[PDB]
Design a protein around this ligand. Structure first.
Ligand code: B12
Length: 577
């Protein structure tokens, strides 16, 4: 009765792998397994005779990642069935190469890595994933214990770039020869070509996306290009170095002295800082239903590699259809989670009295302005300014020497602690779709809580806009007074400051969230930052900070001048080691 259920199980298998169907997969995988001598011919047969189809159609714009992930599911549920008949009839069976991929020790961003991960499992490459915040040691060990042909690391935070150079050294100090691919959006063909490739006498290549990966990995293993490639790359990474070496610099830096003097000019005498309708640290929660109306689906589609800016992306004559069903499944999931409460976004907010002092934000235990409960430290742009001031988030706060009782706030929210468990849940049932789906949503609900919270802060809590009324649109455009910078962003690059935010809020004590070693957060889908009210506070980039400030900062933090140089490596205005 089903026109497609009337074909050879080897052509319906290609169908199941294309139209993503696991309903008749176990039979369409067993039938071809019985019509097969040694159990693995199906693996290298109709499975790949279909994956190569999934790929070819993928590259012709006749498929998209969202679908390829549903295809990879059938391919894994098909292999999750032929695992036994190959455990008792071990034959290994050929692939296109094995590779150990993992998220640089300390970092949490993994989806971008899990995408490139399957994109290769669609080219018959075996990908022994390791996860996030994985120690460079475990990574190399795996490379050996599994005799991998390559190693791909992924990191999007600042500490990453440093923990990556570590692996390059270890591979070079332990005799490795397999290539070393650096991954991440933040990681550039520059940092890789200047601060990493030179620490490993082996192939160290960078890739922009999960699309280029397939191309690179290929000509990196091919016995007819592997040489033309490597040489071509090394000669290129040579250009980058000398290129940025010449542009080093174009805009001369400045002294922390002349910098602080040329600070955000503003007459605090005329102005009068808006008092906080409230003060203290209050735990806060919000149903998924409440947050759903704050979600920014733009990045959501942007994750599944779908060019578009919601909602117009739902129309787009290209992926409009896919963007829809994806958006459908997304919501359909949020529905079950919101009803079953199987996921509950949690968070905490706080408001304290504070004042600026040089480049720091003194935080008092109460209006008395006597005893300090902590001090938020902030850097200051250190390049030559023309017409503008070397901005520092400290400026936007009333200088202690003005009496103007100013205030500052902080927060830390998560799309729920159940992220991990849920992810592993689908992980077991071999379903990368919902696994990456829930992770993506957790991120959404997470950032959604950040807006929803900040709103109630601008309106109620802080109270400098109680009658403020905006639609999700205006919010994304940031149609409001004040900014909510967070540790890591160009405004406040120093990551260890997350410490302060976790201190002042007793976050783990009110939310459960935790800070690892590289000052990463938990669960993965979690955000935390500050709150500033001053109607002129804007997001800028600290840029390049010179020595004199690294020291002075290491002095205010009590951190070893060197250790500091590490956390702000990408921001250092010189070439330290
Ligand atoms: C979603 C997201 C998050 C999630 C993370 C969960 C997850 N699994 O991804 C959430 C909302 C929780 C978050 C929080 C934070 N984030 Co964030 N986040 C993003 C965002 C919007 C997109 C990145 C993303 O996932 N993209 C989609 C994927 C598919 O793309 P991709 O990672 O770039 O991958 C492509 C390639 O680069 C490549 N690639 C990647 N992996 C690999 C591996 C190999 C082997 C190879 C060869 C290539 C390769 O393949 C991909 C194509 O598919 C960005 C903005 C941006 N500019 O990218 C910031 C960004 C990464 N975040 C940033 C920061 C500041 C933070 C926080 C510290 C903020 C805070 N709360 O205080 C925290 C991290 C701590 C924590 N534990 O939560 C910065 C980093 C800057 C810095 N100096 O540190 C960014 C760049 C923003 C900015 N412009 O400043 N984040």
């Amino acid at each position: 009765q089903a026109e497609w259920r009337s074909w050879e199980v080897n052509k319906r298998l290609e169908y199941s792998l294309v139209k993503g169907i696991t309903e008749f997969i176990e039979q369409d995988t067993e039938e071809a397994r019985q019509q097969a001598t040694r159990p693995c011919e199906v693996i290298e047969g109709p499975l790949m005779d279909g994956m190569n189809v999934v790929g070819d159609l993928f590259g012709e714009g006749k498929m998209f990642l969202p679908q390829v992930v549903k295809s990879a599911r059938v391919m894994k549920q098909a292999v999750a069935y032929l695992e036994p008949f190959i455990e008792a009839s071990k034959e290994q069976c050929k692939t296109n190469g094995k590779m150990v991929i993992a998220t640089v020790k300390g970092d949490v961003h993994d989806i971008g890595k899990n995408i490139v991960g399957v994109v290769l499992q669609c080219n018959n490459y075996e990908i022994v994933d390791l996860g996030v915040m994985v120690p460079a040691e475990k990574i190399l060990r795996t490379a050996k214990e599994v005799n991998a042909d390559l190693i791909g690391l992924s990191g999007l935070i600042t500490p990453s770039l440093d923990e990556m150079v570590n692996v390059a050294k270890e591979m070079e100090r332990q005799g490795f020869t397999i290539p070393l691919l650096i991954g991440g959006a933040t990681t550039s063909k520059a940092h890789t070509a200047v601060k990493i490739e030179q620490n490993y006498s082996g192939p160290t290549v960078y890739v922009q996306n999960a699309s280029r990966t397939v191309g690179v990995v290929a000509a990196l293993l091919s016995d007819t290009q592997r040489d033309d490639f490597v040489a071509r790359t090394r000669k290129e990474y040579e250009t980058v170095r000398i290129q940025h070496g010449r542009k080093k610099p174009r805009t001369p830096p400045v002294t922390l002295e002349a910098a602080r003097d040329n600070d955000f000019a503003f007459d605090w005498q005329a102005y009068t800082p808006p008092v906080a309708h409230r003060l203290g640290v209050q735990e806060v929660e919000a149903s998924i239903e409440t947050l759903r109306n704050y979600i920014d689906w733009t990045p959501f589609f942007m994750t599944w590699s779908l060019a578009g800016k919601y909602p117009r992306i739902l129309e787009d004559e290209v992926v409009g259809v896919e963007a829809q069903r994806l958006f459908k499944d997304a919501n359909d999931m949020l529905d079950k989670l919101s009803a079953e409460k199987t996921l509950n976004p949690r968070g905490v907010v706080g408001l304290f009295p504070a004042n600026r002092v040089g480049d720091d934000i003194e935080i008092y235990r109460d209006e008395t302005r006597t005893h300090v409960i902590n001090v938020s430290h902030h850097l200051r742009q250190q390049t030559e300014k023309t017409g503008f001031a070397n901005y520092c988030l400290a400026d936007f706060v009333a200088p202690k020497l003005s009496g103007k009782a100013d205030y500052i706030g902080a927060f830390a929210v998560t799309g729920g602690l159940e992220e991990d468990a849920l992810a592993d849940a689908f992980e077991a049932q071999h379903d990368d779709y919902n696994k990456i789906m829930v992770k993506a949503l957790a991120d959404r609900l997470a950032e959604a809580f950040a807006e929803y919270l900040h709103e109630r802060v601008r309106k109620v809590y802080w109270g400098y806009a109680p009658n403020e009324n905006l639609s999700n649109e205006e919010l994304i455009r940031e149609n409001y007074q004040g900014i909510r910078p967070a540790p890591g962003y160009p405004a406040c690059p120093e990551h260890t400051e997350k410490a302060t935010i976790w201190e002042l809020l007793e976050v783990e004590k009110h939310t459960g969230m935790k800070l690892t070693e590289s000052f990463a957060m938990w669960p993965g889908a979690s955000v935390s930052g500050w709150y500033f009210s001053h109607p002129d506070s804007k997001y800028y980039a600290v840029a390049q900070i010179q020595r004199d400030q690294v020291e002075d900062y290491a002095r205010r933090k009590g951190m070893s001048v060197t250790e500091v140089e590490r956390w702000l490596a990408p921001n250092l205005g010189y070439d330290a080691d």
